[PDB]
Structures are given as C-alpha cells and as structure tokens.
Amino acid sequence: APMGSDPPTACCFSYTARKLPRNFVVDYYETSSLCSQPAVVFQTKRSKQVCADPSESWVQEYVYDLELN
Amino acid sequence: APMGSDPPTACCFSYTARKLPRNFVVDYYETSSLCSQPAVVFQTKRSKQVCADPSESWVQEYVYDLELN
C-alpha cells in the first residue's frame, strides 16, 4: 500500500569527546541507514542520547556489555 | 544548567523526485543545522514529511505560499 513519503533521518553529524562511564549508560540506540554515515547512540541518565564513533573500540566494548546483562 | 548531551539530528539524506501538488502540502518543516546539509521538508496528506532540495525554485515558491495564507 502507499507507504510514507521520504521524511528526514536521525543521522549523527558528530560525536561526544569523552567515553561515558558505564555508570552513565543504561541503554543505547543505533542510527538509521539511509545516510551513508550511521553511528551508535548511548542513552545516559542526565541527558538523552549521545552519538559515538563506532571506530572507537570502547564503543564496541560497551555495546557488547549491553548485549549481555 | 547541564543541558542534553549530543543526540542525533533529523537531517535529510536525499529528496523526492516529483514536485508535490499544492493539493498535497498542508504544511512543511525545516531540518536542523548541526549537519552541514539542511533542507526543507513538506508535510502532505497521505504521507508525513518529504525532504526537498532548496535549490529547486518551486520549493522556495511553495514555501512563500505557506508563509502567506
């Protein structure tokens, strides 16, 4: 059926500059795909969501910890 | 006070390919600014929002009509 048209896309334009302490990341969220530059988004406690360069190994590590417990 | 962190940004990655008939644009919405590539978003009746290249004169014209009545 006629699906949506072509809305924008929540793509990160940059990233923070400090690794969020595990005590500051209760969850996370990934970007879209349309834009050729997706990224991982960490959800904290006194903020909302923070973009993170997947190129930083610590980002992949925190994601793994979130996949576990 | 401690504002938000650095959430993603609703930036358009592309644009439709056909001018939306005036009978298909009851309103519109502009993108953010963080990303060096903002754009205008038209709100239709059987969709939601559609990105549009501000380089197309018809896009600037429809925006003017929306600023009037």
From Swiss-Prot, chains A, B:
Domain of life: Eukaryota
Membrane-spanning parts: none
Disulfide bridges in this chain: 11-35, 12-51
Protein name, entry field: C-C motif chemokine 4
Gene source species: Homo sapiens (Human)
Upper classification of the organism: Eukaryota, Metazoa, Chordata, Craniata, Vertebrata
Part of the intact protein present: 24 to 92 of 92
